[PDB]
Design a protein around this ligand. Structure first.
Ligand SMILES: O=C(Nc1cccc(-c2ccccc2)c1)Nc1ccc(C(=O)O)c(O)c1
Ligand SMILES: O=C(Nc1cccc(-c2ccccc2)c1)Nc1ccc(C(=O)O)c(O)c1
Ligand SMILES: *Cc1c(COP(=O)(O)O)cnc(C)c1O
Ligand SMILES: *Cc1c(COP(=O)(O)O)cnc(C)c1O
Lengths: 295, 297
């Protein structure tokens, strides 16, 4: 565990059994086990899963000759990808400018500046800004196969190593990188694997998306998401972000499926970031209806 | 990396070279290297170093027969130790009640309840209230992190061995001094294996575990210095740490400048104890440093 740079202290995230919240942790008289396992991607340099594609997208753009020393990077995001890229650019000697509206909160804005980024439909605006300079590159996490590659070459191998007996992989669907990359890999090695997606109730379709890979899709409501998140910290001591709530809700559906049909299940689910940056929204305390409108 | 419980997903935290912020990362014509290495103890179940002694103190109290199934735990803390114990108690089947003042914020309070703790407040009133609750029924226990050798043991048996393994060539270990667990435990261990090791403490300007023999230096750090360093650390190295890391880093840069001036090698390990997330609401990462200084108190 000795790294000459933070960029290497990346991935190799733990997988943790959720014994209290699993439908059936122990095999028994009433049937085989139905287990949830949690992949803690919040144990990453910036505390989110986006550290994986961020570093990969920079290394690929280098390899394709787009990125020369002292160059400048551009991307549409004011969230987790922004943070990740800013960390990674700073360390690779690059300059960053992120792509967001004025509307975007003071919290998100100041966090990016703290990491050293600079501040500026939004996908299109960005493409135009890259077309301004030869040394200005736009990585495009929504289209970039390096996003999908980072999970193919990291996340999937780690899961399979920790959980050879895996039956399902559940994860949030945003850029689609996680599900595409991890699902492509898991299918190759575990033929019977099911790849389940969790998403918000209502946008665009990413170039990375391939529908064949998914077995199922769950549309999750705010109240459900929040409730699950809260259950997850109350019961398991894991303080996750809101997308984990959605993922967990979907994973409990799947799990209830296996339990009803008397089958084994080992369900791996992605904890993509922690609850720290969602705390200011009150959503962890008070009523769930307060929390729903407060999001 | 497959764990049947979160309690095992603990320790084995990474050590990361700070190349930009190090006084001299490369050995050269002008002299030997002077390096800072960062032990990322924010990569822990609850995001702080207190996960290590919290789990240890529960396992020891079990072994000493204080903790039977369904029992209840008590401690003076509304911070990181409280969070850690609440996580750990919940998973070991125990009940928790924490001990705090009125002053303590709504943030800290709600975070503890979110982990499942219960609430008692007035720092020493609160220690005494807890004492009373152990006297209610003998199966209610107070772990006493400030006195408990299991606190010191967790760094002796984990933190130190991990450092030495990653950094055999270590010359200094720098860490914040609160309960003293980190410095005592890690320093006792490092001295046994690296004779010439220097154990430097960082603390703020104005415990039974404390042993003075162990420290080679003490640094008193001002709020403005602390905050500035924290900020430098995220700008330059991409590591978003808590305020105590700022203090630690300030001390580690003093030590480091020493070694550079005297033409000596240095490999200085320093503890990043938690992350900046829970300190962000205080504005201290933005604005003026004088705003940040008064906004912390
Ligand atoms: O896709 C995301 N979240 C997500 C995924 C799946 C489900 C939910 C969700 C959250 C609350 C309620 C219901 C669904 C949320 N997050 C996400 C965050 C950051 C970025 C980024 O580019 O910076 C992103 O592309 C997606
Ligand atoms: O020891 C701590 N911080 C620390 C240590 C050393 C130096 C400083 C510091 C911070 C700002 C300016 C100057 C010094 C701060 N924190 C700490 C947090 C929680 C607990 C707990 O028991 O719950 C604790 O015992 C200590
Ligand atoms: C990116 C992200 C997701 C979705 O992951 P993709 O691989 O982009 O689909 C979910 N939750 C959080 C917190 C994220 O940052
Ligand atoms: C506990 C703690 C310290 C001090 O550690 P001790 O081993 O108790 O001296 C410093 N910083 C943070 C954030 C802590 O939680």
């Amino acid at each position: 565990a000795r790294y000459d740079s933070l960029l290497q202290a990346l991935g190799n995230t733990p997988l943790v059994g959720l014994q209290r919240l699993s439908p059936r942790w122990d095999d028994g008289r009433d049937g085989p086990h139905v287990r949830l396992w949690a992949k803690l991607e919040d144990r990453n340099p910036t505390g989110s899963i986006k550290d994986r594609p961020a570093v990969r997208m920079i290394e690929q753009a280098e390899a394709d000759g787009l990125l020369r020393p002292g160059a400048t990077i551009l991307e549409p995001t004011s969230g987790n990808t922004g943070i990740s890229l800013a960390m990674a650019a700073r360390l690779k000697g690059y300059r960053l400018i992120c792509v967001m509206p004025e509307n975007t909160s003071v919290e998100r804005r100041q966090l990016l500046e703290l990491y050293g980024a600079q501040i500026i439909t939004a996908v299109a605006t960005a493409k135009e800004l890259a077309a301004t300079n030869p040394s200005w590159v736009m990585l495009y996490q929504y289209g970039n196969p390096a996003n999908t590659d980072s999970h193919y070459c990291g996340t999937g191998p780690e899961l399979l190593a920790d959980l050879p007996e895996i039956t399902h992989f559940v994860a949030g669907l945003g850029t689609t990188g996680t599900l595409m990359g991890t699902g492509r890999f898991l299918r190759e090695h575990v033929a019977n694997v099911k790849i389940v997606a969790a998403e918000p109730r209502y946008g665009f379709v990413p170039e990375l998306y391939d529908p064949e890979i998914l077995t199922a899709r769950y549309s999750v409501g705010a109240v459900d998401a929040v409730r699950r998140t809260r259950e997850l910290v109350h019961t398991e001591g894991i303080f996750a972000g809101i997308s984990t709530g959605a993922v967990l809700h979907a994973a409990l559906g799947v799990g209830a499926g296996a339990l009803a049909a008397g089958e084994r299940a080992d369900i791996a689910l992605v904890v993509a970031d922690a609850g720290w940056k969602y705390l200011s929204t009150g959503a962890y305390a008070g009523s769930l209806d307060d929390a729903e409108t407060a999001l």
